[PDB]
Subunit: 332 residues, 4 copies
């Protein structure tokens, strides 16, 4: 084996990230303004805009969830707070009209009661929210939720970064599979544990397991530009989950911070010291202040629409069939 040892499977693939590829233009009759950006979040739920906000305490509470839903996407409420308060945030969202909302739950001992309280509050989507879903406890939670509340609530499981893990969630009854182990902007798992999977390859692999079963893939983490949304969807994802790109908005939790004459907001991993309060797998950082959510979503969707024009994609389902060119470090 060219890279060492005698086992060709030891280094099992070459992982590509968003920056490694560009979408190729193709024959097009599609004007950006007329593209249909709707897409499946889950088997049953279709969003007008294929974007959901991260389940993080510096990204999504009620205000963000309301704004995301009004913009045609959805928020996933974070779970770093008492069950009663999270359920109260769900009720706050539902009191602003017929707005979709999701909420994260873990697999710990309080997870089941949390899930039931969220169900009682009218949640539309439960996200079984872990760093590594290829685990019996996570698969069992997904299955139990689907068998118990599955007729009224869509159940998302994650996160995964391999075909086999995606396949396991599908078998457990997941209504969507969330992909991303290691790619988050505030993630240190790659350096702390040495574990991860570049996101374009992770999506291609997860999609290979999920698409044949009609299960949508949510691309979660590592998206830094509007163009990355188009790349994620072209790799076969049905929606993208955004943390960093939304953390600087007015609607995210937290105050405005002024450093060196510039405006920022705090953005921190849920595995950071501050969020857990230990072996942290996230950092506490800041992102530039970006103004209203509605405006940020406009620009993100605008970039997606441009990509749909260039690739001749009238719908997100067509964009999922677009082709890439791999680029070098020289090219950017």
């Amino acid at each position: 084996v060219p890279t060492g040892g005698d086992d060709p499977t030891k280094i099992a693939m070459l992982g590509l990230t968003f920056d490694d590829v560009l979408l190729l233009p193709a024959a097009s009759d599609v004007l950006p303004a007329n593209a249909d950006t709707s897409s499946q979040l889950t088997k049953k739920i279709r969003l007008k805009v294929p974007l959901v906000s991260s389940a993080m305490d510096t990204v999504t509470e009620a205000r963000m969830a309301i704004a995301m839903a009004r913009a045609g996407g959805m928020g996933v409420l974070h779970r770093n707070l008492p069950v009663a308060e999270q359920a109260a945030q769900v009720e706050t969202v539902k009191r602003s009209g017929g707005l979709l909302v999701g909420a994260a739950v873990g697999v710990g001992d309080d997870a089941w009661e949390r899930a039931m309280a969220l169900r009682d509050a009218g949640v539309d989507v439960l996200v079984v929210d872990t760093a590594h879903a290829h685990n019996r406890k996570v698969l069992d939670m997904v299955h139990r939720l689907k068998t118990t509340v599955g007729d009224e609530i869509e159940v998302v499981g994650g996160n995964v970064a391999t075909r086999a893990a995606a396949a396991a969630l599908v078998e457990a009854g997941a209504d969507a599979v969330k992909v991303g182990v290691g790619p988050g902007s505030i993630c240190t798992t790659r350096v702390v544990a040495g574990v991860g999977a570049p996101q374009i390859t992770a999506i291609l692999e997860a999609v290979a397991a999920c698409a044949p079963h009609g299960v949508p893939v949510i691309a979660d983490g590592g998206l830094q530009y509007s163009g990355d949304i188009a790349k994620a969807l072209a790799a076969g994802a049905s929606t993208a989950m955004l943390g960093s790109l939304l953390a600087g908005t007015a609607e995210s939790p937290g105050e405005l911070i002024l450093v060196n004459g510039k405006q920022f907001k705090s953005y921190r991993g849920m595995g950071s010291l501050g969020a857990m309060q230990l072996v942290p797998e996230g950092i506490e950082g800041r992102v530039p202040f970006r103004g209203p959510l509605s405006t940020v979503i406009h620009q993100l969707v605008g970039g997606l629409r441009a990509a749909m024009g260039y690739t001749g994609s009238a719908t997100i389902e067509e964009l999922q069939q677009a082709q890439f060119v791999q680029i070098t470090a020289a090219g950017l």
Copy 2:
């Protein structure tokens, strides 16, 4: 597939940019001073120097077009101004002698009248000027122009980045095909839409469709050094279109700007906020002030002549047969 999924066509190629390759020296009896730098701009029009200036409002108005023609190249007048004023710029150029001039038109509702006014003003070349020519409206415009004014005016279509798109323009009747989706120095399409094609590969692909039909390729965007002109032509282009490299010259529109004791000129994408005045796909920047055009062209052509000496290319047609070595990130 090593990079993910089961479809070998999903990542369809490895795209190389100028920085990824160098021209190999070959046996030579050619002195740089004696090389013939002439080349086809279009099927009928041969330039003394294989260089044309970008159709941009910080690059080419009448003064630049006149200087480019006198230097042996050509200018393409930008279309970000009223039809009457663009036609007046054509007449200004033709009043400075028997100088070649081109002018850009779009495919919007005013495009046809603009084209006819330019024809009336004596324009030699019409450039159907879009970001993505693989589209029925663009192909129809190229065809209608060729069938209507084609005996007196050469019609260029662009831009493309794939073999199939180049082939479509050829079939529509293009007299030249302009290549470049995403590579411009001021371009943000790669990050906003996630779309693009590294330019050496784009030229190789377009040439594969155009050369067998005797249609010249204009390499447009991403050229940062005189050596890139030689690389573009060796990849099979017949001319290069330059924006950034010419924007700092005396003859470009705009004033001199002084920042930190150094001289610059403004250079902005036609898809920037300022040019359109929205989802911008270009930035507004600056380039170092470079002095007279004639002098910049001297240095650019000087580099091209050096490359022709090293590669044993007596003519541009011979340079189109030169070979490359691919280099690593370490090498530069």
Copy 3:
């Protein structure tokens, strides 16, 4: 041959370093807190934590060796001091309880007497400590030690970076093989001599020679993050030797240094000018002050435990069977 000449063996492999790969998550029933981190240092000696401190005069003297042993690892006492003083350091360690300790010896004329004095002092492990063990003098020293004191002392030989060199040490009777030629943070061998081997490939190759003979591999040099420990072990090493990562700790030799308001400690190669006091193959530098050893080891082991959770590795022997994905320069 694509890279030049006609000999495919001239460039014999593509060498990967830690930064070139990530560990892939796999199905897991393993909680980080419950993983078994124990591993073979040598054929007979199993450590609770698979970490040993470098035999360097800015890393390991008695205080460090004691702290490493108490933390479940081991120290290798440096040999840049008189024989009597090194033996006295061994006795200091053994007087702090039943603590494992190793000590470095060379192959020069004083090496044999040094080894015997260390034996007399109660040393558990002798490390034949060279930059290049594929040499008759080094193999002879390993063999003579194993035949003379091998029943009471485990003998480590190093360093190697190739399969053949590892095989030679195995044949000579080594109880462990230490891998690393060129990768150390303070190493300049790569630039001074132009010699080296990227560490992931070096480990894969050495393991191919050592594992079939039941000889553990110690990965020595180039580890910069806790995640690199997991990568080294997954490549097949049984323990990791750390210099830079431990040099900033309270227990390392040397004083605290204050520069620009920040705390550091000196860290220098044993091939640096200062250590030898010539053609140096190491530099004299500094590392950030890190606090107590016990705390640094906690974080390092914490990262390893996280990796074991993600990869479903209940033991280090299972982690040695984990798989990698190769990443690009874009990905990190």
Copy 4:
């Protein structure tokens, strides 16, 4: 073709530079101090140290040539001065004892008289000194010199970067072939003309043409570290020519320059504006002041000796058979 077009020969190879490879250690009985560093400069001339100084006006005049010869290498006197003065520099060198010396000549109209004056002055080596030797005028000059003064003077031709060009010089009667088109530290040919060849690949290719005819290869340009000398020789070169590495020495022409509290010397390409006094293919820069030549050579040879120890190379001829590992951008 993965990189574009339908012609697999268009991008003819992947070119590696020094930074792309490391030498692999191999079984060794060689101590650095006992390696034999002697090597053929030309078919007849063997140097004690395989190093020659560049024919540049900021590197080699009489003082440098004398010091290089005393150190066991050789200087090549630059030709940017009147014939009478260059010949006088040769006589100055020969008046310091039985010291080898070379001198550069071009192929212009004064080249033949220059060569004869140098012959009359007692020069040992004539270097036909061009940027591109694959040219009838250069091959003719090499041949005419070899047929006219070849019994008393060794004739070097250069520079080349391809197998075919090297083969042409061999056929013309060259006693050595000098390799390097584009790699020099002060070279801008790669950016001005877009022409070049990464040096490890260039050496491998030239050696494939030269070694079977017993013609030594001089690796000229791009060497930045002592380790690069070992890499160049292992790729099959017999000597290395150094510009930048020797330009900072006391013996080079030019004065000491003080900027920002640090000492430098001017170092400029022979294709720079200043040297020619136009389309320059070199820059005028500076290098850190390095002290006496003898000391710099000691360190360079020291690194080479280290490499010979690691690779088990008793002689330069053995080092020419050593193997490489290719490294990634991550590895350094």
